[PDB]
Amino acid sequence: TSGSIINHANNLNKVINHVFADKPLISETMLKILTIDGTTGKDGYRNWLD
Amino acid sequence: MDVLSKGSLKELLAHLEKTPLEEAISYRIGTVPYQNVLISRNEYYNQLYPDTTSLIDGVSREGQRNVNGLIMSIISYVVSGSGHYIPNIGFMLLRRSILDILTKHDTGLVTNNLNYGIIARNLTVSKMNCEQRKRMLICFKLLAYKDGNQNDYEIYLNQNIPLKQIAPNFIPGDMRTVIHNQDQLAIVGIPAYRLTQSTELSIRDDNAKSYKLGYVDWYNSNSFLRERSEFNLIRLKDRDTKYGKLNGW
């Protein structure tokens, strides 16, 4: 509803870390995909959400 | 393959100015068109797949030795990638560019009597796609303005509504119109979808796919010009400049 795509994806990763704190592998794996996709910028972040 | 890769009116017209007429004609005898044939398509069927030969396939075919045949071969080269077999035309005509043949009176060819109805019928237009039709309408428009038959071109378009809807908008004598045009005229290119190394049933589709897979090989080969990497190595004459315009336009 509000905010940017970059902020939407970055803050979603933090909540994933908090919700799945018992299994840290989930956040580590998701950030691996974001690192590859995020090099293109806002379009890369949109692809990650897709 | 090079002609089919042009995606804009500027690039297509620039290529036609550079290339000579000998590229439009072919020196292989081929076969005759409008013939019902049985071809072998073993990836799909065991029997022989029926089809009909046409002038739009990418294979060379025997053509008539007249001005009508010469124009059909030029349009076939533009919309299919290969021309027909019309020999002994003469070195005076074969040296000149395809654009000069289409829109210059100095060449000596007489094209006033040409009728667009039979040319479209012979160069089967019910079997073309949107990109192929646009290129043919470009050739018709260039010819019409060469012989002062603009009124006949308009009436022909008004008779055929679908052709009018996709007809490119440019004046053959003005370069500003070519720059502003944003039609997509590319028949081969880098595909967004998944292109595989498989056969197609029709003669037209199989030959078109061969050109498409061929362009991918050429795109990744050493003959392609990557502007972002070696723009300072091209000569100044052939470098891309906005001031650049077609001769006489």
């Binding site: 090099t39 293109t40 910028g41 379009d43 | 972002r228 990497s229 070696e230 723009f231 300072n232």
Partner: protein, 51 residues
């Protein structure tokens, strides 16, 4: 000169603020031909004499 590789973001979303109009130096050169010529000739010789 070796070509410069821009990042992919610069190529799609890159913008530059530049003024593309070139002003002629003729008004100064024509008015003072002797002074303009002497200035540039002396500058070039100081550079060439060091080859």
């Amino acid at each position: 000169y070796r070509p410069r590789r821009f990042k992919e973001i610069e190529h799609t979303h890159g913008y530059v603020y530049r003024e593309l109009n070139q002003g002629s130096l003729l008004p100064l050169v024509d008015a003072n031909l002797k002074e303009s010529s002497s200035y540039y000739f002396k500058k070039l010789m100081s550079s060439i004499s060091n080859v």
